[PDB]
């Protein structure tokens, strides 16, 4: 009958929580982009903050790091056995990872980050391609893609075309302003807009809201088997 209605309002009390964990070569506006993905603002550091509404626990890189996720897939699974329950996880609801704008192939550093990180949850991405042409842009799309290929595991994105469109331009290249004139980056040669294509900024803004159900994989996939490796 109806329950999708009464399901719907039900996050109304409760909804919702995202943690994601940023890596990338600083550089390139991880923290400037995120805020305008977020319309707000700021060897690792931590981000928990909230908006009209939802809770954010969100970790930046500034491989020590693979402790801290499985520190978190520890603490999930400590309490799950199970005595007592209010309670929390800081699970890695996704990660991002950021190649360059410039100079070509994909970096050995990115590779062996991107190999051994991968159980949690990447969106790889490109910052600052108002460097990059569409003739450049497409050039890195695929030779990234193939680079994935000699290999790989970031997260394959489980309205007909709204999906099937976003996915085929993965990965997508993105500039955050939080300045403007209409956001928002300033050239005397010419002017550069957010949220167009133009910018694959919104593919991610609108994708990553859309699903938030690495909720769901990170919970099924990556910690289930971190039980199933780690218990067993």
């Amino acid at each position: 009958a109806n329950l999708p209605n009464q399901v719907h309002r039900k996050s109304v009390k409760k909804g919702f929580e995202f943690t994601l964990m940023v890596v990338g070569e600083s550089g390139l506006g991880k923290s400037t982009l995120i805020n305008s993905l977020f319309l707000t603002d700021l060897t690792v550091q931590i981000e928990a903050s909230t908006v009209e509404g939802v809770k954010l626990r969100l970790t930046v890189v500034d491989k020590t790091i693979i402790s801290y996720i499985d520190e978190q897939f520890e603490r999930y699974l400590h309490d799950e056995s199970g005595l007592n329950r209010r309670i929390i996880d800081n699970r890695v609801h996704c990660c991002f990872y950021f190649i360059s704008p410039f100079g070509h192939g994909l970096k050995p550093l990115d590779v062996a980050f991107m190999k051994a990180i991968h159980n949690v949850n990447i969106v790889p991405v490109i910052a600052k391609a108002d460097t990059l042409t569409l003739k450049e842009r497409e050039r890195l799309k695929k030779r990234i893609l193939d680079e994935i290929e000699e290999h790989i595991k970031i997260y394959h994105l489980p309205f007909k075309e709204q999906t099937r469109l976003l996915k085929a331009s993965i990965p997508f290249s993105v500039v955050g302003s939080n300045q403007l004139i209409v956001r928002g980056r300033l050239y005397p040669w010419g002017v550069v807009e957010v949220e167009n294509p133009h910018n694959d900024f919104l593919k991610l803004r609108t994708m990553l809201i859309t699903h938030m159900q690495d909720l769901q994989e990170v919970t099924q996939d990556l910690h289930y088997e971190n039980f199933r490796s780690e218990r067993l």
Binding site: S26, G27, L28, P101, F102, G103, H104, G105, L106, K107, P108, L109, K128, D130, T131, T133, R185, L186, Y187, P188, W189, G190, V191, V192, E193, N196, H198, N199
Partner: protein, 246 residues
């Protein structure tokens, strides 16, 4: 003294028509900020894996003519490429023409006798370069350049040029500039930075700090760095080394 006596009949013009005429440029930089794309664009014509590798060309040009070696050279990443590679060319370029010139003479036969490096840095907001440029503080002739210039706003080129300068002197390094010289002397200080086809986001591509480096670097103060280079790196190159044999 007083050679100061009083009097009709160029000698400088004579040594103009010392027409044969030679130069080396090296760029060094990560794979791939367009060092090559710099070079053809500068002279308007065409020319990720492990360990420090340097790449070798030389070519020739006209209008009355000149024979010119370009190398560029490449580097990446897991981080002491940079002590090793350029001592590869540069010392050993450089002891060499000592080493002709110990011995028979004078055949007017070199490049890498090293002449300029561009180190191209990249652009945004670094450490490998700092040691790279201070280790390559040595020198060869290091001009200091900033790649894919269409990555920054002008409000940041305000910001990142004039911050990155403090950096040059923070651990302070040796550099180039020139000494005449209002316009030689404006342009040294004016950290410079650099951008295709015609005619005349959505990106249409040239005003831009391309020429300034064109016209001093390539036009104007032109052999100063040739002779700085034979003055400097022949000179710490033998004097250290003759320090060391003798």
């Amino acid at each position: 003294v007083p050679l100061a006596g009083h009097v009709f009949d160029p000698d400088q013009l004579v040594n103009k028509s010392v027409s044969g005429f030679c130069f080396n440029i090296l760029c060094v930089g990560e794979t791939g900020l367009g060092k090559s794309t710099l070079m053809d664009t500068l002279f308007n014509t065409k020319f990720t894996q492990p360990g420090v590798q340097l790449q070798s060309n030389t070519y020739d040009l006209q209008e009355v003519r000149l024979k010119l070696t370009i190398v560029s050279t490449v580097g990446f990443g897991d981080i002491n490429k940079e002590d090793s590679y350029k001592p590869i060319v540069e010392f050993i370029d450089a002891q060499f023409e000592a080493y002709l010139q110990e011995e028979i003479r004078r055949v007017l036969h070199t490049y890498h006798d090293i002449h300029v490096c561009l180190y191209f840095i990249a652009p945004t907001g670094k450490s490998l370069d700092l040691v790279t440029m201070k280790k390559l503080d040595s020198k060869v002739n290091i001009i200091p350049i900033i790649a894919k210039a269409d990555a920054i706003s002008k409000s940041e080129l305000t910001k990142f040029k004039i911050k990155i300068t403090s950096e040059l002197v923070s651990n302070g390094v040796q550099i180039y500039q020139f000494p005449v010289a209002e316009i030689n002397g404006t342009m040294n200080a004016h950290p410079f930075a650099v951008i295709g086809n015609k005619m005349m986001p959505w990106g249409t591509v040239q005003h831009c700090d391309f020429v300034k480096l064109r016209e001093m670097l390539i036009r104007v103060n032109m052999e100063d760095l040739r002779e700085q280079t034979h003055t400097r790196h022949y000179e710490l190159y033998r004097r250290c080394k003759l320090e060391e044999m003798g």
